[PDB]
């Protein structure tokens, strides 16, 4: 199996997490 | 050693105020030098590494952010991670955060693994600040231990066999993986070469073949280098960092390279989220991204 | 913008 990405089958490509600094 | 003693006051900041340091004593951190140095040595200077995978850009002693990417992430050995070099030189802790991975390295020497950046390199990071941190919190001594175990990192890891990974780049000298199982180590960084480009060199998409490189040492290559090199060894993606981009990662050429940078707002001319890449056991590959929230 | 050895 080649890589893939996660959105070649409809997943998230990404998650993104936002932080404060503090 | 007291490893775990270590690794405990080195997570104590965790949830205090940012920018708070970790004063290991001077023999708790040369102890994590020697040891980590042997098991670099005892490991190949071309690891050859099994999905799933963590895979980490550039982190530049941004401790708390390094932190905040383990809590994402998992936790060594809840997750296995490959980090990409540049732990030091930028940020103001940089000796807290090669510490917590040289002290990682040592615990989980077969799920946790750090490569060479270019920033560890006695000559780049006497200027862009470690030596001032270890010269200020320690001694020139102890920065001069930190590069004899800088000097035996390994350079670049193949996961899976489809995944080349890297600090820098591509180098128009590398034919065969087997030039870089040939270089020995200890060794410094040259100004010139084959593990020059490998710490150094950067895509371009404004170039056709080999190019010059802006910073004024090293290359650049384009898209057909890229395929071309994935095409011989076959191989389906070069994995590197070295370079600031606002997502914390980003696609080149037709999604056969990804950057990959970890230290979030690292550059006054524009913000920019880090990130890690998440490769499953099946080489399915995603990204966790740390965004500050304004 | 740091000073391109690198924003």
Same mark, same amino acid.
């Not at chain 1, 990405?5 to 503090?22: I, M, P, Q, Y």
């Not at chain 2, 071309?228 to 606002?246: G, M, P, S, T, Y």
């Given at each position: 199996?080649?890589?893939?990405?996660?959105?070649?089958?409809?997943?998230?490509?990404?998650?993104?997490?936002?932080?404060?600094?503090? | 050693?007291? +490893?775990?003693?270590?690794?405990?006051?080195?997570?104590?900041?965790?949830?205090?105020?940012?920018?708070?340091?970790?004063?290991?004593?001077?023999?708790?951190?040369?102890?994590?030098? +020697?040891?980590?140095?042997?098991?670099?040595?005892?490991?190949?200077?071309?690891?050859?590494?099994?999905?799933?995978?963590?895979?980490?850009?550039?982190?530049?002693?941004?401790?708390?952010?390094?932190?905040?990417?383990?809590?994402?992430?998992?936790?060594?050995?809840?997750?296995?991670? +490959?980090?990409?070099?540049?732990?030091?030189?930028?940020?103001?802790?940089?000796?807290?955060?090669?510490?917590?991975?040289?002290?990682?390295?040592?615990?989980?020497?077969?799920?946790?693994?750090?490569?060479?950046?270019?920033?560890?390199?006695?000559?780049?990071?006497?200027?862009?600040?470690?030596?001032?941190?270890?010269?200020?919190?320690?001694?020139?001594?102890?920065?001069?231990?930190?590069?004899?175990?800088?000097?035996?990192?390994?350079?670049?890891?193949?996961?899976?066999?489809?995944?080349?990974?890297?600090?820098?780049?591509?180098?128009?000298?590398?034919?065969?993986?087997?030039?870089?199982?040939?270089?020995?180590?200890?060794?410094?960084?040259?100004?010139?070469?084959?593990?020059?480009?490998?710490?150094?060199?950067?895509?371009?998409?404004?170039?056709?073949?080999?190019?010059?490189?802006?910073?004024?040492?090293?290359?650049?290559?384009?898209?057909?280098?890229?395929?071309?090199?994935?095409?011989?060894?076959?191989?389906?993606?070069?994995?590197?960092?070295?370079?600031?981009?606002?997502?914390?990662?980003?696609?080149?050429?037709?999604?056969?390279?990804?950057?990959?940078?970890?230290?979030?707002?690292?550059?006054?001319?524009?913000?920019?989220?880090?990130?890690?890449?998440?490769?499953?056991?099946?080489?399915?590959?995603?990204?966790?991204?740390?965004?500050?929230?304004? | 913008?740091?000073?391109?050895?690198?924003?």
């Amino acid at each position: 199996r080649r890589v893939s990405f996660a959105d070649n089958f409809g997943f998230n490509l990404v998650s993104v997490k936002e932080f404060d600094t503090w | 050693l007291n +490893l775990d003693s270590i690794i405990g006051r080195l997570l104590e900041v965790q949830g205090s105020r940012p920018g708070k340091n970790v004063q290991l004593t001077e023999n708790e951190i040369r102890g994590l030098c +020697l040891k980590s140095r042997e098991i670099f040595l005892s490991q190949p200077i071309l690891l050859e590494l099994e999905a799933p995978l963590k895979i980490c850009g550039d982190i530049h002693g941004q401790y708390y952010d390094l932190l905040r990417l383990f809590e994402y992430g998992g936790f060594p050995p809840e997750s296995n991670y +490959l980090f990409l070099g540049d732990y030091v030189d930028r940020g103001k802790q940089s000796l807290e955060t090669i510490c917590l991975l040289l002290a990682y390295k040592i615990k989980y020497p077969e799920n946790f693994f750090l490569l060479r950046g270019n920033h560890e390199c006695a000559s780049i990071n006497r200027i862009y600040g470690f030596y001032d941190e270890c010269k200020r919190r320690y001694n020139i001594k102890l920065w001069k231990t930190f590069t004899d175990c800088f000097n035996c990192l390994p350079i670049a890891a193949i996961v899976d066999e489809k995944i080349f990974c890297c600090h820098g780049g591509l180098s128009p000298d590398l034919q065969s993986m087997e030039q870089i199982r040939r270089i020995m180590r200890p060794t410094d960084v040259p100004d010139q070469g084959l593990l020059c480009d490998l710490l150094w060199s950067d895509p371009d998409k404004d170039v056709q073949g080999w190019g010059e490189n802006d910073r004024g040492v090293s290359f650049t290559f384009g898209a057909e280098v890229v395929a071309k090199f994935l095409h011989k060894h076959d191989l389906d993606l070069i994995c590197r960092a070295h370079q600031v981009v606002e997502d914390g990662y980003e696609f080149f050429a037709k999604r056969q390279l990804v950057t990959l940078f970890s230290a979030p707002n690292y550059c006054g001319e524009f913000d920019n989220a880090g990130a890690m890449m998440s490769v499953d056991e099946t080489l399915m590959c995603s990204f966790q991204i740390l965004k500050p929230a304004d | 913008x740091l000073x391109r050895x690198x924003x």
